[PDB]
């Protein structure tokens, strides 16, 4: 869902 998509966004470090 959007909750996971937001979780990948915050942890993205590239």
């Amino acid at each position: 869902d959007f909750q996971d998509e937001l979780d990948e966004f915050f942890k993205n470090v590239s």
């Epitope: 869902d1 959007f2 909750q3 996971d4 937001l6 979780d7 942890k11 993205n12 470090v13 590239s14």
Partner: antibody, heavy 122, light 112 residues
């Protein structure tokens, strides 16, 4: 101290675009995500979008995808929101804010700009 | 979206009294790691919003300890244990688990 500096009140004609700025200071702009929040006169707050100044990645409220475009200039420690196709509904105060972090740091907006008030009028 | 319903919307309070604001969520706020990104903001007249409570119950530095926030899942609460005159303003809850959304705002007025 952490400060977000937003320009003063701006008047823009309908149908044009407007790019408002937000100067971060007292911290390194790339260490913190930034939110932009909209507040229409006498109305609640509304989240527009979130930018990660390190890599420019953005995420938008669906109601503002196509209307707002968040960018960041690292070198000058300034974040920008561009609004396009301005109508009377885009007359409001726009806030840039800094996000504390993630997980047990909180995703809260801990410091807020004073807000840029925008009147759309012919 | 996630709708954050706040109760009450108008809160007339006496100076010295306790005051509570409820915040109900249409969805349960909990990411995979177990974090509830529910915050509380105060907007005083003519000022930017300012952070009060983040992560449900952690008090932002500088906030007096009169302010506390509890709750789990879909029900949340903000408490002011002893209300001062300078606490008048609009109180917003805010979630960052799904696409971020504010509550309608609670207008706290001083009864005098």
């Amino acid at each position: 101290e952490v400060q977000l500096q937003q320009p003063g009140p701006v008047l823009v004609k309908p149908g044009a675009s407007v790019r408002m700025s937000c100067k971060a200071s007292g911290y390194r702009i790339t260490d913190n995500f930034m939110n932009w929040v909209k507040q229409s006169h006498g109305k609640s707050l509304e989240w527009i979008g979130i930018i990660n100044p390190y890599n420019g990645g953005t995420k938008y409220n669906q109601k503002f995808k196509g209307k707002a475009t968040l960018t960041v200039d690292t070198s000058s420690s300034t974040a920008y929101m561009e609004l396009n196709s301005l109508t009377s509904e885009d007359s409001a105060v726009y806030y840039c804010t800094r996000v504390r972090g993630n997980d047990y740091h909180g995703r809260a907006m801990d410091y807020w700009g004073q807000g840029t008030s925008v009147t759309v009028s012919s | 979206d996630v709708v954050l319903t706040q109760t009450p919307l108008s809160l007339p309070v006496n100076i010295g009294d306790q005051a509570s604001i409820s915040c109900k969520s249409t969805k349960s706020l909990l990411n995979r790691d177990g974090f509830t990104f529910l915050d509380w903001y105060l907007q005083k007249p003519g000022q930017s919003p300012q952070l009060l409570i983040y992560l449900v119950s952690n008090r932002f530095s500088g906030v007096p300890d009169r302010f506390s926030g509890s709750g789990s899942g879909t029900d949340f609460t903000l408490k002011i244990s002893r209300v001062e005159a300078e606490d008048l303003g609009v109180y917003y809850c805010f979630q960052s688990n799904y696409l971020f959304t504010f509550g309608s705002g609670t207008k706290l007025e001083i009864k005098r």
